[PDB]
Ligand binder design. Structure first.
Ligand code: FES
Ligand code: FES
Ligand SMILES: [Fe+2]
Ligand SMILES: [Fe+2]
Ligand SMILES: [Fe+2]
Lengths: 127, 132
């Protein structure tokens, strides 16, 4: 078949063994975003120590692509400064996600969006 | 809230600890169906012994609802006769699925559809004397 899309080994790994699944009780930052197509929700929790992401968790009922991308992005964001974290997007893992069905772009965007939201929440709390 | 939707505890359980995830190499029956809206694929693999489902696996990259329903339905189908298996639908776990966002109906249909497809595959192999 021409124009094959599907699931790569990295993505599969992230699906099967996602990093940073769960919740943080009374978090410094909480972000929740929704996928406009399927309606799945993505939630990200941050603990901020120094001015860095000390801990990060995510939970979602969405699809394999959303979960793997969340695994990736939260791994990336662990230990980064808030400023660095705010600049993380799905592009930072474009290599891993290449070959995914293209409709999973929205799924992939959930993670970074939720991170951003969390950070914003934290900032506003800091007022 | 009006028109409340959400997720049950059973569905949560199935999402977190799904039964029968994976593949069967050289299966007696193979079924693959697709969700027309998101594009996710659902695959079911059966081993048939004594005109029963001896072993069953599923593989999907779809959403929590799809995965939990698959977990349920493959659990149900283990050990059933082909005839019984063909009659299993999402309705057999209607209680677990009640109140899901309505877009998850197609997600929930994937499992039983793929089961059906698998069984049909097996049957047609049998008819063609190509079964093992
Ligand atoms: S299908 Fe809903 S997040 Fe991907
Ligand atoms: S969103 Fe794709 S199977 Fe449910
Ligand atoms: Fe989108
Ligand atoms: Fe549908
Ligand atoms: Fe369907």
């Amino acid at each position: 078949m021409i124009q094959q899309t599907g699931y790569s080994k990295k993505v599969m790994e992230h699906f099967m063994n996602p990093r940073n699944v769960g919740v943080i009780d009374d978090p410094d930052g909480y972000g929740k975003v929704g996928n406009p197509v399927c309606g799945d929700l993505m939630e990200i929790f941050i603990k901020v120590g120094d001015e860095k992401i000390e801990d990060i968790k995510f939970r979602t009922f969405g699809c394999g692509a959303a979960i793997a991308t969340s695994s990736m992005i939260t791994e990336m964001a662990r230990g980064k400064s808030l400023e660095e974290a705010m600049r993380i997007t799905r592009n930072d893992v474009a290599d891993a996600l290449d070959g995914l069905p293209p409709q999973k772009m929205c799924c992939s965007n959930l993670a970074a969006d939720a991170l951003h939201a969390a950070i914003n929440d934290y900032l506003s709390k800091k007022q």
